[PDB]
Design a binder for these strands. Structure first.
Length: 115
DNA sequence: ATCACATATTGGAG
DNA sequence: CTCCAATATGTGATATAATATA
Protein backbone atom coordinates (compact mmCIF):
# COMPACT_ATOMS: atom_id res chain seq x y z
CA UNK A 1 0.00 0.00 0.00
CA UNK A 2 2.67 2.50 1.12
CA UNK A 3 6.40 2.05 0.66
CA UNK A 4 8.73 2.63 3.59
CA UNK A 5 10.40 6.00 4.05
CA UNK A 6 14.18 5.83 4.29
CA UNK A 7 14.86 8.55 6.90
CA UNK A 8 12.97 8.90 10.18
CA UNK A 9 13.34 10.78 13.46
CA UNK A 10 13.20 10.05 17.19
CA UNK A 11 11.65 12.90 19.18
CA UNK A 12 12.80 11.89 22.67
CA UNK A 13 16.30 11.19 21.37
CA UNK A 14 15.90 14.45 19.38
CA UNK A 15 17.79 12.84 16.50
CA UNK A 16 17.11 12.19 12.81
CA UNK A 17 18.49 8.95 11.36
CA UNK A 18 18.94 8.07 7.68
CA UNK A 19 18.99 4.34 6.90
CA UNK A 20 22.25 4.17 4.96
CA UNK A 21 22.48 0.43 5.65
CA UNK A 22 19.23 -0.31 3.80
CA UNK A 23 20.27 1.84 0.82
CA UNK A 24 23.83 0.52 0.42
CA UNK A 25 23.17 -2.99 1.74
CA UNK A 26 25.92 -3.02 4.39
CA UNK A 27 25.25 -3.75 8.06
CA UNK A 28 28.42 -2.08 9.37
CA UNK A 29 27.36 1.27 7.88
CA UNK A 30 24.41 0.90 10.28
CA UNK A 31 26.67 2.56 12.86
CA UNK A 32 26.78 5.76 10.78
CA UNK A 33 23.02 5.93 10.15
CA UNK A 34 22.16 8.37 12.96
CA UNK A 35 22.55 12.15 12.62
CA UNK A 36 22.90 14.43 15.65
CA UNK A 37 20.62 17.45 16.09
CA UNK A 38 21.61 20.16 18.57
CA UNK A 39 20.15 23.64 17.98
CA UNK A 40 16.74 24.06 19.60
CA UNK A 41 15.08 26.08 16.82
CA UNK A 42 16.08 23.47 14.25
CA UNK A 43 14.97 20.79 16.72
CA UNK A 44 11.49 22.28 16.40
CA UNK A 45 9.68 21.30 13.19
CA UNK A 46 12.07 18.35 12.80
CA UNK A 47 9.10 16.45 11.37
CA UNK A 48 9.14 18.90 8.45
CA UNK A 49 12.85 18.20 7.95
CA UNK A 50 12.26 14.44 7.91
CA UNK A 51 9.23 14.67 5.61
CA UNK A 52 10.90 16.90 3.03
CA UNK A 53 14.09 14.83 3.16
CA UNK A 54 12.00 11.72 2.49
CA UNK A 55 10.33 13.53 -0.41
CA UNK A 56 13.64 14.52 -2.00
CA UNK A 57 15.06 11.01 -1.55
CA UNK A 58 11.94 9.34 -2.97
CA UNK A 59 12.02 11.57 -6.04
CA UNK A 60 15.75 11.03 -6.62
CA UNK A 61 18.35 8.87 -4.87
CA UNK A 62 21.51 10.79 -5.87
CA UNK A 63 21.19 12.71 -2.60
CA UNK A 64 21.86 9.41 -0.80
CA UNK A 65 25.23 9.10 -2.54
CA UNK A 66 26.02 12.70 -1.62
CA UNK A 67 24.98 12.26 2.03
CA UNK A 68 27.11 9.15 2.47
CA UNK A 69 30.11 10.89 0.88
CA UNK A 70 29.78 13.88 3.23
CA UNK A 71 29.43 11.51 6.18
CA UNK A 72 32.59 9.69 5.04
CA UNK A 73 34.49 12.98 4.94
CA UNK A 74 33.17 13.62 8.45
CA UNK A 75 34.35 10.17 9.55
CA UNK A 76 37.89 10.91 8.35
CA UNK A 77 38.31 13.53 11.11
CA UNK A 78 41.80 14.62 10.03
CA UNK A 79 42.55 18.25 9.11
CA UNK A 80 38.83 18.82 8.49
CA UNK A 81 38.96 22.60 8.42
CA UNK A 82 35.75 24.58 8.11
CA UNK A 83 36.99 25.62 4.66
CA UNK A 84 37.36 21.97 3.61
CA UNK A 85 33.87 21.14 4.90
CA UNK A 86 32.57 24.21 3.07
CA UNK A 87 34.22 23.00 -0.15
CA UNK A 88 32.76 19.51 0.26
CA UNK A 89 29.25 20.86 0.88
CA UNK A 90 29.64 23.26 -2.06
CA UNK A 91 30.75 20.57 -4.50
CA UNK A 92 28.25 17.92 -3.44
CA UNK A 93 25.12 20.07 -2.97
CA UNK A 94 25.67 23.69 -4.01
CA UNK A 95 27.33 22.84 -7.34
CA UNK A 96 24.99 19.87 -7.93
CA UNK A 97 22.77 21.20 -10.71
CA UNK A 98 20.68 18.01 -10.61
CA UNK A 99 19.65 18.46 -6.97
CA UNK A 100 18.79 22.13 -7.53
CA UNK A 101 16.73 21.16 -10.58
CA UNK A 102 14.80 18.41 -8.80
CA UNK A 103 13.98 20.76 -5.92
CA UNK A 104 12.91 23.41 -8.44
CA UNK A 105 10.67 20.89 -10.21
CA UNK A 106 9.07 19.79 -6.93
CA UNK A 107 8.34 23.44 -6.14
CA UNK A 108 7.08 24.27 -9.64
CA UNK A 109 4.74 21.27 -9.87
CA UNK A 110 2.79 22.20 -6.71
CA UNK A 111 2.52 25.99 -7.04
CA UNK A 112 -1.08 27.09 -6.48
CA UNK A 113 -0.50 30.81 -5.85
CA UNK A 114 -0.39 33.82 -8.19
CA UNK A 115 0.99 36.74 -6.18
C1' DA B 1 7.59 28.77 28.01
C1' DT B 2 11.68 25.01 27.69
C1' DC B 3 16.63 24.03 28.72
C1' DA B 4 21.78 23.72 29.56
C1' DC B 5 24.56 25.00 33.01
C1' DA B 6 25.71 27.01 37.87
C1' DT B 7 24.77 26.53 43.25
C1' DA B 8 23.25 25.95 47.84
C1' DT B 9 21.45 21.82 50.56
C1' DT B 10 20.83 16.97 51.86
C1' DG B 11 22.83 12.24 52.19
C1' DG B 12 26.91 9.68 53.52
C1' DA B 13 31.30 8.15 54.89
C1' DG B 14 35.80 8.56 56.03
C1' DC C 1 36.60 18.18 60.71
C1' DT C 2 37.51 17.47 55.32
C1' DC C 3 35.93 14.98 51.27
C1' DC C 4 32.74 12.57 48.38
C1' DA C 5 28.56 12.19 45.55
C1' DA C 6 24.12 13.53 44.34
C1' DT C 7 19.54 16.39 44.60
C1' DA C 8 16.74 19.84 44.15
C1' DT C 9 16.87 24.76 42.81
C1' DG C 10 18.48 29.03 40.38
C1' DT C 11 19.84 31.72 36.11
C1' DG C 12 21.03 32.87 31.48
C1' DA C 13 19.94 31.89 26.64
C1' DT C 14 16.68 30.83 23.43
C1' DA C 15 12.01 30.20 21.22
C1' DT C 16 7.10 31.41 19.63
C1' DA C 17 4.65 33.47 14.25
C1' DA C 18 1.42 31.74 7.63
C1' DT C 19 -4.00 38.78 5.41
C1' DA C 20 2.68 42.65 2.07
C1' DT C 21 3.99 47.90 -0.21
C1' DA C 22 9.00 55.61 1.15
Amino acid sequence: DILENYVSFDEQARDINIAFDKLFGRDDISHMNNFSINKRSYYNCLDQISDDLNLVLNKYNDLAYSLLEIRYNMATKENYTHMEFYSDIERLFIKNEKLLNVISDIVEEEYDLDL
